[PDB]
Structures are given as structure tokens and as C-alpha cells.
Symmetry: D2
């Protein structure tokens, strides 16, 4: 199977697989059962922001999710990614709906990664910034139900013509270039990701969530990953 590291914005409490009893943000290391979570005051219909950071000095993956004028939610987990991910990866966004649903709309996404050489002390860097997504956005690999171009946005899951979100939908978008996320010979390394999102649901409760993720380069949506598995994992182990 794929190797996954993710920061989840989980809108539905699946307490039977270890979720806390409230919408929450979490850090997922090779399992949908987050290693760490924080309660998230999710706001139906409002545009929010996610900020994710990691560096090789502290080796602490942290995320902050917030809405303008509200208090933020933050989660952190100590993890040495050199022991978890392959050296080269792809980065992406993933989202799902199940019995319950919501729009999983992405309005912007940026990423920056840097590796400073132990031998020369010079750096390699990659940076991308999407503020609009065209109908043919060739530097993204769309998987599942993901589409781009509608109102200039990236819709991770299925939305009908009438603007309503559909259930049992899974969609992901990965940046086309492989990313060198760690290197033994790098003296310092870091990455950061930011995205803005709009989750609206007409249901009695939204589901299932959005995640920023890092995976093997040939990662694909696992079988049976709609709903609570967020398009990320083949099971709930």
C-alpha cells in the first residue's frame, strides 16, 4: 500500500475508529487513527485557512487551522519524517463525503520546500502557489472525483450542477513534480503548506473532511476509502 503522512481537517466524529467526539484537526502518520488531535470549531459555509509546517531541526509537524476573527485550532506532533516517508514524494490535497456530505472546495494552495546541503551549504528549493485553478491545470494530477475550473476553484469532491455536494465521493489533487522531502546529507530542511477552503453542508452534520498529505510518488486513491477514510487509507487500522 501507499505510505501516507497527512494533516486532516476531520468534520465527522467516527468514534468507533478512534476520532474524538467533535470535529477536529489531526496528524496522521501511516494511519487514519491520528497520533494527535485538537478540537476544531468548524464553521459551516465560511472560508477558512490551514497552515502546515515542519523542519528537520525540531522534527515537529505542526498545523494551525482558523477562520478570520475566530480563535485558531493548533496541533503538533514530534515525528522524524526521515524514518517514515521515502526521500522523494508527491504532495497533495484529498477529501471525501460518505453517508453525510459537504463541499470540499479549495480556493488557494501553496507549498514551499527547502534542502540545504551538508557539503556545500547551498540550498535546493521548490515553491508553488495556486490562487486560481483553471479548467485544464496541467501541473496537477486529479484523482477520483476532483475537478478544477469551476469558479476558478478546485473541487475535491463531487458537486452537482445545482451547487449541492454529493455523498460517497472521494477526490484528490497532487502537484505534478516529485518533491525531495528529506535527504541524509542535508544539514537543514523544511517545508510549509497553506490552503484556503470552503466546506458547506446542507445536512444535519457535515462529513467527512479535507486533508493535506505527503505520499509515495505513484500514490492513488485506495479501494474503499470514501467517507471516514478521507481518500487516504485502505482501512481504519
Amino acid at each position: 500500500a501507499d505510505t501516507i503522512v497527512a494533516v486532516e481537517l476531520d468534520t465527522y466524529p467516527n468514534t468507533d475508529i478512534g476520532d474524538p467526539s467533535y470535529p477536529h484537526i489531526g496528524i496522521d502518520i501511516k494511519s487514519v487513527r491520528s497520533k494527535k488531535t485538537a478540537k476544531w470549531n468548524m464553521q459551516n459555509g465560511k472560508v477558512g485557512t490551514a497552515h502546515i509546517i515542519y523542519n528537520s531541526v525540531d522534527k515537529r509537524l505542526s498545523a494551525v487551522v482558523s477562520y478570520p476573527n475566530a480563535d485558531s485550532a493548533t496541533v503538533s506532533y514530534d515525528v522524524d519524517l526521515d524514518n517514515v516517508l521515502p526521500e522523494w514524494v508527491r504532495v497533495g490535497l484529498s477529501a471525501s463525503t460518505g453517508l453525510y456530505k459537504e463541499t470540499n472546495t479549495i480556493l488557494s494552495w501553496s507549498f514551499t520546500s527547502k534542502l540545504k546541503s551538508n557539503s556545500t551549504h547551498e540550498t535546493n528549493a521548490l515553491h508553488f502557489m495556486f490562487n486560481q485553478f483553471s479548467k485544464d491545470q496541467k501541473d496537477l494530477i486529479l484523482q477520483g472525483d476532483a475537478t478544477t475550473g469551476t469558479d476558478g476553484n478546485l473541487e475535491l469532491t463531487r458537486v452537482s450542477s445545482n451547487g449541492s455536494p454529493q455523498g460517497s465521493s472521494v477526490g484528490r489533487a497532487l502537484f505534478y513534480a516529485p518533491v525531495h522531502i528529506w535527504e541524509s546529507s542535508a544539514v537543514v530542511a523544511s517545508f510549509e503548506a497553506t490552503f484556503t477552503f470552503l466546506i458547506k453542508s446542507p445536512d444535519s452534520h457535515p462529513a467527512d473532511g479535507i486533508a493535506f498529505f505527503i505520499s509515495n510518488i505513484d500514490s492513488s486513491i485506495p479501494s474503499g476509502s470514501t467517507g471516514r477514510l478521507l481518500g487516504l487509507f485502505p482501512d481504519a487500522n
Copy 2:
């Protein structure tokens, strides 16, 4: 055939196909017969720098090539790239040898492209910086004889174990992600490229040169392009 825009650092004067009678830099628009050239006082065995810029306001492609403590060479050409290239391209470096030869070693390569939306005034941007090239550089597509990793450099053309450049060699490196180089609905767009290079000629008579180029995404080295055609064109038309 491919669609090619390039800046050439031409170390060998092929006067039968329109080169001036001295080493020169040139702007090539869909032909190896440059639309504009400038004399280039090349310094064999010395590390040089090339800087290439263009923006959609001036629609002028300009390049500056030089070595530390020497006078620079500059060439410029007015051209509306929206009428020349496809909207989506790849960018790369190419070089060749022929009857005569030289090392075509790249020590660093950076690129930044940005497109600002007419409807939102927000920007999409891509940036990469290589200061070292590893043996498995997954974000580069190597073509022909190009290799990475020897001393952390990109060797565009074949170099023997003893360090001696070989003749009849052609090689290119392209960035893995497609690049959105122009857009009708972009109110302002720009790109910039920089690279550092070391052309060594152990017999003091080098050929054929290095180029930065922009092509259709699926471009391959054309048949018949070693030597004076720089790995870019199938003929001298």
C-alpha cells in the same frame, strides 16, 4: 516538429548556417538561426552565469551572460510569446558537442514564473532552484547523454571517466512539472531563468554550446540535432 524558444550560448561559429564569425549569445525563435545575437567573449574553464528574463508588459526577451570581473554580454529581442508558444510548456537546458567538443557542466539552475489573473488580480507562481544535482534527481527529465550527480553537477553532454568531454554528444534536462507560461486572462505575467555553467575545452577549440529553452511539454531531442543544432532543432532552417 517541436515548438522551441531558446537562448543559446554558442561557442562555435557555423557561418554556413548564419552564425556570426565569433562565439556569441543569441535568441532563437523556432529556428537555430537566431533572430538577434551578441558577441560573447567566452572564457574557457571559467564558471559563468546566464540570466534570462521576459514579461508580458514589455514582451521583450533578454539575456545577460558573463563571468565574474568581466564585461557582460547582453542580447534582447521583442517577441510576443503568446503568439509563439503553447500556453503550457516545459523548460530545460540543452547542450551538444559534434566534431569538436567541450564540457557542458551546469552548476546551478533556477526559474520563476508568475501569472496574475485579470479577474481576481491574484497570482499563480512556480519557483525552483537547483544548486546541487543528485544521482537520482527525480524532478528532472534527463534526455540523451545528460547525467546528474558527478560532483553534484548536471553534465549535459558525455564526459569520460578521465574527465575528457566527448564529441557527437547531445543531452538535455527538463523540469518535471509543466509550466503555464502565458494566459489570455492574465493581466501581467513574467518569467526569469538563471544558471551557472562551466564549459572546459581541454584542446582549446570548443563546440557546440548550451541553451536554455522553452518547448512543448512532450518535446524530445530531435533526430539529427547533435553538434551545431544544439539538441534543439532537426535542421538549420
Copy 3:
């Protein structure tokens, strides 16, 4: 007197001093009588964007001014700034009202300047980005009637408590650090400025305009510069 290079967004045609008979954008080199203008279809009460660029390879100062979903206005002028400005300058925004008036509200301002050494080929760079202006914005020198903090914006000219712009007002904001704008030993240099602005004219007859300018470091608002002189020049010569 000061040494001023500016891009003006001139909302009021002063034909007795050489303005064209319509709102326009212009390039001003040591005189309020622009060296080049372009017609500007200004949209009162709408948020606009201005983009200014220059580099030492082309030696062309260009500006683009526009509003979302409208056609842009562009103006360009060839000028070697090494022969015009001092090596070290400050950069700023200026605006004025006179007999007639308008809000001259700035919502964002960014600038980037870079100088690449001829001897080392390494670069010095400065970058700042303001997306919000606080009540005590210590990295700005406010001159005249300019204030910061109301709604997080920079109000270059006087606005009353009821929100109504006042006449005979002049104000400027300059970045605190001096900027090295050109250097003889720099092989390549460039700058770029961007700002977003909101000019509201409650009586539909606005004056006088906003400018981005580059001046000697110790520049103050000239005596007699309210109104058509834009806070930049002591007279119309």
C-alpha cells in the same frame, strides 16, 4: 530640490500644465509633466491594482494599472535610472487633493529590489509586503496628512470621521529603510512595486491622484505641492 521618479495615477486633467484631457497614468522623471502617459478608465469606488517594473538590462520603466474584469492601462518609458537617481533612495506612495477631492486609500503595498554583483555574481535583495497597516506602523515614515490603522489601511490624504475625503490635503508614506536602487558594479538589477488602491469620489468629480515614487532618502513633501503637484514637486516645470 528633491530628485523624483514616479508613476502617477492622475485622476484630474490639468490641461494648463500639460495633462491630457482625461484621467491617465504617467511616468514622471524629475517633472510633473509626464514623459509618457496612457489613458486610464478609472472606476470610482472600485478597488484597483498597480504594477510597476524596471530592470537594468532593458532600462525601461513600465506600469500597468487596472481593476478586476476590466481592460488594463499600460505606460512605458525608456530611461536609464543610473543617470537620474542617486544610488541610494527611499521608495514611497504619495497622494493629494486640492479644490476637488477623493479618498486615496492604500490596501496593500509590496516592493522588491535586487542587485547582482559583477565581481561575485551573488545578489543583494530587499523585499517588503504590507497587506495591513497598523496604527503604529514603525517601518513607515508618514508625511503630511497620511495616517495608518483605520480599517487596517493607509489613508494617504485626510478623511473625516464621517468618511468624507477632504480637499487641500497631501500625504506620503515612505519605507523606513534606504534602498540601493542602482550600482555601477552590479551586472544585473531590477525592482518591482505593487499596490492596491481605493479612490472614492462621493461627488463624482475626483482629484488629484496617487503616485508611487522613488526619491532622495531625505525627501520631504515640497512646499506648494498639494493638488495637481501630487505631493511630489514644488512647481509644474
Copy 4:
């Protein structure tokens, strides 16, 4: 007195004021007696690199100091700078010699700071990069014995004409613009600083060290701060 936060590269063990018995890097919070140190394998005559980072999510100030091809030294300390520094500061480099001496040469210095608003989720940012220092570097405030321009470098302490370093010398360089280092209303904030240095000593042991520091805007070299106080503190409390 001034308020100081610093990362020290301490080349001389003053065990009588709490230094460990070896050259070391440390984090100094309002006292020369570091809150945390790490042993530093300082290399006489070799060019090294320092990297300093902090963000408001983790609130952990960390530093990595290293030489090419050697193992790095790293030090980290949990500290909420909102409770230590004023909101607006200046940033700088400082160095000293005493009975024993060394060159305290700076070859490059860069800094980046960012503040994202809780109300709009937009960012303010400052970035500067010095790769050469001219004889008249107007965006630096030089204090004490600091000079710029010699071989394009910043010499923090006195160096004689013959290339030899002098004793009892103190010198600092601060960036001219005030920096907004924290803000209550910022949802996320971060800063990073990098510099390259050359410390050479002809003595039986080098002294006293180099520091990156953050202080009140009007900070000046304290009385009696040569030698072990690093030009930072008025005493050893």
C-alpha cells in the same frame, strides 16, 4: 537597559560566568548566561554557516551552526517571545574580542519575518539578503568598531591593516528598518536568520564570539561589553 534575545557563537569558555568548558552555541534570553547551550566544534580559519528559526506555533527558538563536511551543532529553547521582546525591534549581528582575539568576519546575512493577521489571514513580510557589504551600506547601522567594505565583507571587530585582529574590540551591525516581530492579533508568525562567518585567530585560543540578536529599536553597545559580554549585555547577570 536594552532588552536582548540572542543566539551566541561563543568561542571562549568563561566558566566563571556559567559558560560550559568548551566553545559552544547558546540561546540568550535577557542574560549572557545562556538558557541553553550545545557544544560547538569551532574550526579556526574556516567559513561556517548559522541558521536561526522561530515560529509562534511552536514558540521554540532554534539554531544550527555548521561547517561544510562537518557535523552540525544545534540548540533549541522553548520561549514565548511575546513575553520577552517589545512588539517592534531591530535585528542585528554583534561580536567582541578581549584579552584574546579573532576576526569576526561576516560574508553574508539574510533575514525573513512574517506576520499573518487573525482578522484577514493576509500577511505582512520583510526580507533582506546581504551577499556583499559595500563601503557605504546605508541600510545598516554600524556601531562600535564595525566596518563594511573590506573585501566586500562586514568586519564586526577591529582588524589592523596587516590583516590581524585586535583585542578589546566590540562592533555591531543592525538592519535599518524596525521589524514587527510579534503581534497579539497575528494568527501565525515566524522569522529566520542565516549568516556565514569566518573566525580566524592567531592566539593560543580565540575569543570572544559572534551573536545574532534582536533588541529594542534604539539598542546601543552597553558600557563595558567587550570580551565575554559580546557587545550585548552591560554585565554578566
